[PDB]
Amino acid sequence: SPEFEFEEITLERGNSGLGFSIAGGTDNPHIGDDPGIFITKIIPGGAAAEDGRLRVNDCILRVNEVDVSEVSHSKAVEALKEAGSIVRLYVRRRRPILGTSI
Template sequence: MNGSVASGGYSEEIISLTRRPSGLGFNIVGGTDQQYIANDNSIYVSWIKKDGAAYLDGRLQEGDKILAINGKDLKDLRHKDAVELFRNAGYYVSLKIQRRLQPQNGPVGHGRDGESGGLPLAAILVPGLALAATAIWILLRYRQRM
């Protein structure tokens, strides 16, 4: 699984990058003084530069939460302090990231621990039936006026 661990709707992964002359090739947002998500002091990847180190590696994604760099925890840092850690991280950089798992497309099945593998049937049928009923009502109203 390439150093990744999944639990609770999130996966964690260690990503090793080699700094290029232009840097690591991504921007970050967040921190205690510039929360990206309300009530969350974490550091997130906001943008990945095309042809940068992160882009060429292919594993880091926009929206990933960066938990640590070279083993240094990024929890409760000001934005500028996190930026300094990245700038001074050296040539070989190890990132511990957390990513929200995306629901998989495909047949509905049973996942681990009895979790559903897809959307509940009602989540699809109820809006579909409401839309169909509205369309029929509009059609009947239109025919009455003719």
């Protein structure tokens, strides 16, 4: 910050899981060598969509009490799957700043 904002979002797992897809990790970093776990898709009607807070391009930093800021993709996937039925996600989002260069 102020470039980013941070948010905690709790989801109750449903029959369609948490309702989103992720990409990234230390083994498959994005440009700039960013190992972050990023939301790439939110499915209609799933927990994330119904809660309405999560957005595509959000970066998941923590799942319950598991740090996922620097982990492999598979570990992130495991962290989310083993988090159980109530999942607390700590996320980072780029702050929309209406700035002007001087």
